[PDB]
C-alpha cells in the first residue's frame, strides 16, 4: 500500500503545498521557489484532499482529512490552522 497525497498551488512562482497521509497522520511539504521545507500542517487522517483560493494577496487553504466515516476540514487563512465548519450529509 502507499502513502496518500494531495496537492495545491497558487501564483506564478508558484507556491506549492503537498499533503501526505501516512500511518494515520497528515503532514505538509512546501515550495515557494527556493527549496522544499516542512509546513505547519499536522492533523490526524488516513485520507486527504485539498483546495485553495486567493483573495488579493491572501491565500486560503482547506484540507479535508478523513478517518473512517468522519471528515474534518482544516483551514489556513494566514494565521494558523483551525478546524472548519464542514459537516457531512445528514
Ligand atoms: C492507504 C492504504 C492502507 C493504509 C492500507 C491498505 C490500502 C491502502 O490504500 P492504497 O495504498 O491507496 O491502496 C492499496 C494499494 C495501492 C495496494 C497495491 C495494495 C493495497 C492497498 C490498500 C492493499 C494492502 C493493504 C495493506 C497491506 C499491509 C498490504 C500488503 C496491502 O497489499 P498490497 O499488495 O500492497 O496492495 O494494509 P495497510 O495497513 O497498509 O492498509 C491495505
Ligand atoms: C520565527 C520566524 C518565523 C515564524 C517565520 C520566519 C522567520 C522566523 O524567524 P527565524 O526562524 O528565527 O529566522 C529565519 C531564519 C533563521 C531563516 C533561515 C529563514 C527565515 C527566518 C525568519 C525566513 C522564512 C520564514 C518563513 C518561511 C515559511 C520560510 C521558508 C522562511 O525561509 P527560510 O529559508 O526558513 O529562512 O515563514 P514562517 O511562517 O516560518 O515565519 C520567516
Ligand atoms: O510558508 C509555509 C506556510 O506558512 O504556508 C502556508 C501554509 O501552507 C502553512 O501550513 C505553511 O507552514
Ligand atoms: O473561515 C472558515 C470557514 O468559514 O471558511 C469557509 C469554509 O471552509 C467553512 O467551512 C469554514 O468554517
Numbering used by the authors: 1 to 90
Sentences from the paper on this structure:
Here, we report protein recognition and assembly by a phosphate-containing macrocycle (pctx). We show that the C 3-symmetric phosphocavitand is a versatile receptor for N-terminal residues or arginine but not lysine. The macrocycle of interest is the recently reported phosphate derivative of C 3-symmetric cyclotrixylohydroquinoylene, dubbed pctx and produced in 3 reaction steps. , Compared with the bowl-shaped, C 4-symmetric sulfonato-calix­ ­arene (sclx 4 , a known protein receptor), the saucer-shaped pctx is smaller, shallower, less polar and less anionic. The test protein we studied is lectin (RSL, ∼30 kDa), a 6-bladed β-propeller with C 3 and pseudo C 6 symmetry.
RSL–pctx cocrystals in space group H3 diffracted to atomic resolution and the electron density maps clearly reveal encapsulation of the N-terminus. ∼115 Å2 of Ser1, or ∼65% of the residue, is buried by the macrocycle. Ser1-Nα forms a salt bridge to one of the phosphates, while Ser1-Cα and Ser1-Cβ each make CH-π bonds with phenyl rings of the macrocycle. The fourth interaction is a hydrogen bond between the Ser1 hydroxyl (Oγ) and a phosphate of pctx. Another phosphate of pctx forms hydrogen bonds with the Ser2 amide backbone and the Gln4 side chain. Considering solvation, eight water molecules form hydrogen bonds to the three phosphates (H2O···O–P-pctx = 2.6–3.1 Å). A ninth water is hydrogen bonded to the N-terminus (Ser1-Nα···H2O = 2.8 Å). Each N-terminus of RSL binds a macrocycle, the three of which form the base of a tetrahedron. A fourth capping macrocycle completes the pctx tetrahedral cluster and is devoid of a guest. The H3 cocrystal comprises protein layers interspersed by pctx clusters nestling in the approximately tetrahedral interstitial sites. The Lys34 side chains from three RSL molecules each form a salt bridge with a phosphate of the pctx cluster.
